Amino acid sequence: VQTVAFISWLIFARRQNGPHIIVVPLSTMPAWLDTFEKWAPDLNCICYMGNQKSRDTIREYEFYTNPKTMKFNVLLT
DNA sequence: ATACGCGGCCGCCCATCAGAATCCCGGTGCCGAGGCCGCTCAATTGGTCGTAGACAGCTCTAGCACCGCTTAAACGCACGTACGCGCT
Known part of the structure; x- marks a missing residue:
């Protein structure tokens, strides 16, 4: 809880x-x-799991299909 | 002129003397241990030095074990094609 509160307050x-x-x-x-x-609850918590197709999901959710849209911040690896 | 005799010939069983052939004892040639041996040069003997390598101490790699998240690879089965192999 101190880590989540420190990250949120930071x-x-x-x-x-x-x-x-x-x-x-x-x-x-x-x-x-x-x-x-x-x-x-105001911060998203899109973690990183899976193996193959879930990696494609995290990559398609990471950025947009263009040759830099950061839609995340906190994840669990 | 007309009838009796016989003469060697011959099948017969029966006798004598030599030759062929099997068994009782044989010499001969080939192979392989033996013996002999002798000049002698390689092993053995008695001996020194020194150095490999056994051995004990030590430390310091890496081989083992063990676990669990992840997943590619193995498994087993279903279906049919295209070869193994049998015949001619």
Whole structure:
């Protein structure tokens, strides 16, 4: 909770809306998703799972089909 | 002129003397251990030095084990085609 509150306060306080990578094991990823949405619902929590097609989903959701649209910030790898 | 005799010939069983052939004992040639041997030059003997390599200490790689997330590869089965192989 201190990490989520520190990231939220750092984004909405010091104006640091940039992408922040938070590596979390696969077993704890749904727990950090439920806690993350329960304590900070205003921020998305699109994590990174899968193997092949899910990688294509994360890549098609990452940027737009053009030769730089950041639609995320916090993820779990 | 007319009737009796016989003469060697011959099948016969029956006798004598030599030759052929099997068994009782044989010499001969070939092979392989033996013996002999002898001049002698390679192993053995007695001996020194030194150095490889056994051995104990040590540390410091890498071979093992073990686990779990991820997924490519193996599995087993279903269906048919195009070869193995049999015949002529």
